[PDB]
Amino acid sequence: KIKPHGPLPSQTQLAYLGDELAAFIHFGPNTFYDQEWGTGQEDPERFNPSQLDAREWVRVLKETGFKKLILVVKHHDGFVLYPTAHTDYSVKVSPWRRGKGDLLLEVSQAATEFDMDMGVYLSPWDAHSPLYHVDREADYNAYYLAQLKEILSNPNYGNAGKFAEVWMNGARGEGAQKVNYEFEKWFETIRDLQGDCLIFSTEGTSIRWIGNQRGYAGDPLWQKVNPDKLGTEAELNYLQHGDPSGTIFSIGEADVSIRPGWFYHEDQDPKSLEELVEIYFHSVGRGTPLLLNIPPNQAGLFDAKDIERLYEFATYRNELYKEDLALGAEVSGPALSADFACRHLTDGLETSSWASDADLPIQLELDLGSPKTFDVIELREDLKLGQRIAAFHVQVEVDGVWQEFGSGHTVGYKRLLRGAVVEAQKIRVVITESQALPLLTKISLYKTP
């Protein structure tokens, strides 16, 4: 047995890492007011997306490879997109669905049918509620907690009543009241109602912000942090890289909009395939999930360009992963024992691993049997035993001469490393630094389409 190193991910963390892709949906008054941030004075009368089709949202997201949908149910403007008992500023007083509308219900039913996991975004900062005030702090917290209970206990909400993520945005406007939140109480309610549901927050929860909105994870990306270094004035670069000494497993989630804004604006176009590809490589390709926001329009529908783009993106990835050129390749180098053989790097088994206790740098050489054309290499650690690798690089033998392909810091759950297209039969993976004896479960090679 190899001894585990560092903090270990929960089962729900590993599942998210394996799922790789989650979708964000920002829809609400701001959609009708053509804005990114609302005041709380938006007229509920304007809110009438009669064409809204949540099943269409879910169907397209499922067909284009998303595994989770995080729904904004109350943005900063404080308008609530389900008929909560706790405020009259909700869809209840709007014309939508003749006043009997429930978006969380509509989405959850669709998500249930498609087995799409569900997350929920409830804004801590609330620009509408008169309870959002330093002298009503207990009252706002009780209002917030009340809605968490409404959302998380109702078997009509979620994917068959289950939520996979709760999102607690840290953003707050310059002018706003300095309300402090009852974090522990919220977290306990979430564990009561939803077990080990993942929680994105500014505190030491299971998910953290990566510290930017471009969908850019750092390299290194340590999926762990010291809770002491979090909070609302966590360093952006600390978020972006995590902590090589971190004491809790933490997913640095890469959130980004397919458009310049989080909400839909008519004058904006979605990002190009090329752009989405770059993002993909710097999120999923750095061992962290991509959370792509797709904002429905005034009609309540995904924009046609956006849908098309989502298909192109799916096609791209499908083509990318179609043939693993390293599958079955012969690998030489040191190995701890037969149970940790080199051959476990290309055996197609995520349950088999290579490992070596030899002195660094450790070199694995792959022989593909014949020259192949590729421009991506994939590596994966066994995070059940902890994240370890701190530095590595990759060399390819071209025309009898070893040349640099690429290099990186962390591997993590899964690392993709692009390089210039090469035709090569032999490949070297050189591990230069590791926090403990390195394990790898997989090395793969692909050609981008």
Ligand X SMILES: CC(=O)N[C@@H]1[C@@H](O[C@@H]2O[C@H](CO)[C@H](O)[C@H](O)[C@H]2O)[C@H](O[C@@H]2O[C@@H](C)[C@@H](O)[C@@H](O)[C@@H]2O)[C@@H](CO)O[C@H]1O
CA angle (340, 341, 343) in 5-degree steps: 135
CA distance 391 to 431: 6
Report 155-184 residues binding ligand X (CB under 6 A). Answer: 169-171
CA distance 252 to 410: 13
Please state the closest distance from residue 292 (CB atom) to ligand X, in A.
11
Q: Where are the alpha helices (DSSP H) in 153-270?
A: 183-194, 236-241
7 preceded by a cis bond (ω within 30 of 0) = no
Looking at residue 263, the DSSP 8-state letter turns out to be S
Q: Which residue is nearest to ligand X (CB)?
A: 170
Report 252-271 residues binding ligand X (CB under 6 A). Answer: 255, 262
Applying CB under 6 A, among 94, 108, 202, 283 the residue interacting with ligand X is: 202
**DSSP E strand stretches across 356-400:** 362-380, 389-398
Applying CB under 6 A, among 213, 237, 318, 448 the residue interacting with ligand X is: 213
Applying CB under 6 A, among 47, 181, 209, 392 the residue interacting with ligand X is: 209
CA distance 426 to 432: 19
Strands 68-74 and 21-25, bridge-based pairing: parallel
CA distance 367 to 425: 6
Please state the closest distance from residue 116 (CB atom) to ligand X, in A.
20
Q: State yes or no: residue 51 binds ligand X (CB under 6 A).
A: no
3-class secondary structure, 335:
coil
Window 4-23: contact mask with ligand X (x via CB under 6 A):
--------------------
Residue 93 or 176: the one with the smaller Cβ distance to ligand X is 176
Q: Are 445 and 325 in contact (CB under 8 A)?
A: yes
Record the tokens describing residue 406, joined without a space: 């690429």
Residue 207 or 443: the one with the smaller Cβ distance to ligand X is 207
CA distance 38 to 79: 9
Q: State yes or no: residue 57 binds ligand X (CB under 6 A).
A: no
Residue 41 or 373: the one with the smaller Cβ distance to ligand X is 41
Name residues whose C-beta falls within 8 Å of residue 257's C-beta, 6 or more positions apart in sequence.
24, 26, 213, 292, 293, 295
Report 75-114 residues binding ligand X (CB under 6 A). Answer: none
Please state the closest distance from residue 196 (CB atom) to ligand X, in A.
21
Q: How far apart are the first and last CA of the chain?
A: 41
Task: Return the residue matching tokens 């289950």.
Answer: 162
Which H or E run includes 252? strand 251-257
Please state the closest distance from residue 37 (CB atom) to ligand X, in A.
6
Residue 235 or 404: the one with the smaller Cβ distance to ligand X is 235
Largest separation between any pair of C-alpha atoms in the chain: 74
Please state the closest distance from residue 262 (CB atom) to ligand X, in A.
4
Residue 72 or 377: the one with the smaller Cβ distance to ligand X is 72
Please state the closest distance from residue 276 (CB atom) to ligand X, in A.
17
CA distance 70 to 94: 23
Phi, psi of 300 (to 5 degrees): 85, 25
Please state the closest distance from residue 209 (CB atom) to ligand X, in A.
4
Strands 415-434 and 354-355, bridge-based pairing: unpaired
Looking at residue 65, the DSSP 8-state letter turns out to be T
Applying CB under 6 A, among 12, 15, 36, 183 the residue interacting with ligand X is: 36
Q: State yes or no: residue 203 binds ligand X (CB under 6 A).
A: no
Q: State yes or no: residue 250 binds ligand X (CB under 6 A).
A: no
Residue 19 or 36: the one with the smaller Cβ distance to ligand X is 36
Please state the closest distance from residue 260 (CB atom) to ligand X, in A.
10
Please state the closest distance from residue 234 (CB atom) to ligand X, in A.
9
| 349 in a known ligand binding site | yes
Binding residue count for ligand X, defined by CB under 6 A: 10
| 347 in a known ligand binding site | yes
Please state the closest distance from residue 433 (CB atom) to ligand X, in A.
31
Q: Are 168 and 189 in contact (CB under 8 A)?
A: no
Binding site members for Ca(2+): 344, 347, 349, 352, 441
As annotated, the binding site includes 344, 347, 349, 352, 441
Residues lying near ligand X in the complex (CB under 6 A) are found at 26, 36, 169-171, 202, 209, 213, 255, 262
